[PDB]
Structure formats: C-alpha cells, structure tokens
From Swiss-Prot:
Ca(2+) 2 binds at residues 138, 177, 185, 187, 190. It is an enzyme of class 3 (hydrolase). Ca(2+) 4 binds at residues 193-194, 197, 200. Thermostable. This is Thermolysin. GO terms for biological process: proteolysis. Its cofactor is Ca(2+); Zn(2+). It catalyses: Preferential cleavage: Xaa-|-Leu > Xaa-|-Phe. It comes from Bacillus thermoproteolyticus. Binds 4 Ca(2+) ions per subunit. Binds 1 zinc ion per subunit. Its EC number is 3.4.24.27.
Length: 316
C-alpha cells in the first residue's frame, strides 16, 4: 500500500520488545519500505489461503498476543535481509531485491514453517511441541536460506543433495542468530521447541549425536524416510561446519577453528559459485576447499581447516 513510513513498537513471541518498520495509511500496516522492494507481513486468519490480509493495526503498537508472531516474522525477515546484504552483498533472496512476504496464523495448531517458493508461511504450533515458529530467528533464516539455495545452486531436496540443502540452511540460520546476537548457539529451533522443556532443540550442530543424528559419514542414514534422511544426514555437514568455525578433535582428527565469519564466507561462495543441483558430500568438500583457496590461498590455514573438518566427519 502507499503511505508514510513509520516505526512502531511491539512484543514478539518470547515477550521481548522491539521496533518494527510500518507504513501508515489510515491504519498502520506491517510493510517495511526500507529494505529492497519491501518486507510485507500478512494475517492468514487460521485459514490455509495465502497470503491472507496485509497486517493492519489501529495504533502502531503490537502488544497483543495475536500480534506476537507477526512482529517476529516481520522483524526477523528484516534481520535476515540485513545479514545477506551487509555480510555477503546479496540483495534479498534472489539477489535482485525481491520483496519478502510472510504469512502468520496459518491453519490451526500447525507445527511447521516453510518457504513455499514465493513466501514464508508460519504455523502457530500446538503450544506443546512448538510455540509460534516465527519466534525462532534460526528458523526464519533457515527457511529463507532455502530461497537463496533455490535461486543459486538449485540443490534437490532428496538424498545427499537434500542433506546439503538442509545443512546450508542450518549453517546460515545459525550465523544469522549470531549476527543478531539473539541468544546464539549451535542448536536449531531451541527458542520455539517444547516450551515445557528447557535445554533441548530440534537438532544440534555441535553434537548431532545428542539426538541420534549421525556425526560421521560411516553412520549416515541410507533408508527412504525423510526423503532419504535430509534432516538426519545434515548432521554430518553441520558437524563439519561447527568444526571449521570452533575447532575441536573429532574421531581423532584435530581441526583448527577459523571462526564464524570465515565459515560463512567459504560456504556462501561454495553455494553461489560451485554447487549444482545434484552435488553430493564429496563435491561439497571440493567446493568448500576451492572456495577457501579462492579467498585465502592454497597454502592457507583456512584451506587446511576445511580439509581437516571434512576428514574428521569421513567425507573424502
Ligand atoms: O558472528 C558472525 C560475525 O562474526 C561475522 O561477521 O558475520 C557472521 C556472524 O555470524
Ligand atoms: O563449546 C561449546 C559447546 O560445548 C556447545 O555445545 O556449543 C557451543 C560451543 O562453543
Ligand atoms: O547416545 C545417544 C542416545 O542418548 C540417544 O537416545 O540416541 C542417540 C545416541 O547417540
Ligand atoms: O540412501 C542415501 C545414501 O546412499 C547416501 O549416502 O546418503 C543419503 C541417503 O538418502
Ligand atoms: O573414525 C572412524 C574411522 O576411523 C573408520 O575408518 O571408519 C568409521 C569412523 O567412525
Ligand atoms: Ca495495536
Ligand atoms: Ca539456534
Ligand atoms: Ca524446549
Ligand atoms: Cl562436541
Ligand atoms: Cl562429537
Ligand atoms: Cl568439538
Ligand atoms: Cl569425538
Ligand atoms: Zn523447513
Ligand atoms: Zn529446511
Ligand atoms: Zn539460540
Ligand atoms: Zn534428528
Ligand atoms: Zn525431515
Ligand atoms: Zn525441513
Ligand atoms: Zn566429536
Ligand atoms: Zn565435538
């Protein structure tokens, strides 16, 4: 809609207060004109029709419980936009400043969030397994990174390529969580998963085996569930990414950590320059080694650490 750019205030899913960019035209709308072609947040009104109605508010204050998922969907889309622009010089998910659209209150008791090819969709959860999923910055950034992957490498969502696709989304989801300094960790979804249970998450990048996911190629899942294990076998790549950043000794292989910024630069370059739709784990290793070589030199510590990390998880 056309109107005046304003700044409102509200509270997110976890009760935290934050400022959000709105647009004023009789009502205040969740329309952020300051980022690319805009960030737009919609109310799906517990239906499955998309996108729903552009979110309208009478007073530019978003403190009602019904508002909370919209506040966070809107705000964390903005943070994700800022991460890709300021850190990687990428303008929105398509690199051409496409508008980011999100719908909240999708369906009823819906325990999921997804990028559907043109927009973000957030369930409210059932209040036991999940609370509204836009409350997790790593979830928001994980799903938006699927859009980045679709517009670059085109990794297919099954078998090893699909596990790489998932891991890429976990890696950048976590780097956005650190970038925002929002209670950062190497877990996925901890802020919105099982509100009754402290200290758990959907999966761990630092210790995938904590939840039974593999942390070595010899332990990879080879069945047909989960599109061939895309959310299971991602643990192998997630552990490698954790080792590249933080270092450690894993199955007897010592890895010298090089930090989060260089992890992001290496994987972003691998994704945008070298990966293809059917890349497997071995080709990811080659792409990461080449990317580190491009950026830091063939004899650099950065290249050595990438090699060490993939050796540690058994990917040659
Ligand atoms: O913490 C990281 C920061 O150091 C780097 O600059 O960009 C990515 C962030 O995750
Ligand atoms: O050392 C930390 C590890 O114990 C934790 O699991 O994830 C973050 C790491 O830096
Ligand atoms: O030891 C772990 C166990 O606690 C969990 O239940 O399943 C996976 C194992 O790695
Ligand atoms: O069955 C597949 C297996 O062969 C591969 O190594 O990793 C992904 C699985 O889906
Ligand atoms: O680290 C182990 C490696 O040494 C062996 O060769 O294959 C299985 C791995 O667990
Ligand atoms: Ca209001
Ligand atoms: Ca997290
Ligand atoms: Ca929990
Ligand atoms: Cl560990
Ligand atoms: Cl471990
Ligand atoms: Cl470790
Ligand atoms: Cl270990
Ligand atoms: Zn998803
Ligand atoms: Zn995913
Ligand atoms: Zn966290
Ligand atoms: Zn798992
Ligand atoms: Zn899955
Ligand atoms: Zn998924
Ligand atoms: Zn280990
Ligand atoms: Zn470890």
């Amino acid at each position: 809609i056309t109107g005046t750019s304003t700044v409102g205030v509200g509270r997110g899913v976890l009760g935290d207060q934050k400022n959000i960019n709105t647009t004023y035209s009789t009502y205040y709308y969740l329309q952020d004109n300051t980022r690319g072609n805009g960030i737009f947040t919609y109310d799906a009104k517990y239906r499955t029709t998309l996108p729903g109605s552009l979110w309208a508010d009478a007073d530019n204050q978003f403190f009602a419980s019904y508002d909370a998922p919209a506040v966070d969907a809107h705000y964390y889309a903005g943070v994700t936009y800022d991460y890709y622009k300021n850190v990687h010089n990428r303008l929105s998910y398509d690199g051409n400043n496409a508008a980011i659209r999100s719908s909240v209150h999708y369906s009823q008791g819906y325990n999921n969030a997804f990028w559907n090819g043109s927009q973000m969709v957030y369930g409210d959860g059932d209040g036991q397994t999940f609370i509204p999923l836009s409350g997790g910055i790593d979830v928001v950034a994980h799903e938006l990174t699927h859009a980045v992957t679709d517009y670059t490498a085109g990794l297919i969502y099954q078998n090893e390529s699909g596990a790489i696709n998932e891991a890429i989304s976990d890696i950048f989801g976590t780097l956005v969580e650190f970038y925002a300094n929002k209670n950062p960790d190497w877990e996925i979804g901890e802020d919105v998963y099982t509100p009754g249970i402290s200290g758990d998450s959907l999966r761990s990048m630092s210790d995938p085996a904590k939840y039974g996911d593999p942390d070595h190629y010899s332990k990879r899942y080879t069945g047909t569930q989960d599109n061939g294990g895309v959310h299971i076998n991602s643990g192998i790549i997630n552990k490698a990414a954790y080792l590249i950043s933080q270092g450690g000794t894993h199955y007897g292989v010592s890895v010298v950590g090089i930090g989060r910024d260089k992890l992001g630069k290496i994987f972003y370059r691998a994704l945008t320059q070298y990966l293809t739709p059917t890349s497997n784990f071995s080709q990811l290793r080659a792409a990461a080694v080449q990317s580190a070589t491009d950026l830091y030199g063939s004899t650099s510590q950065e290249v050595a650490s990438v090699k060490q990390a993939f050796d540690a998880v058994g990917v040659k």
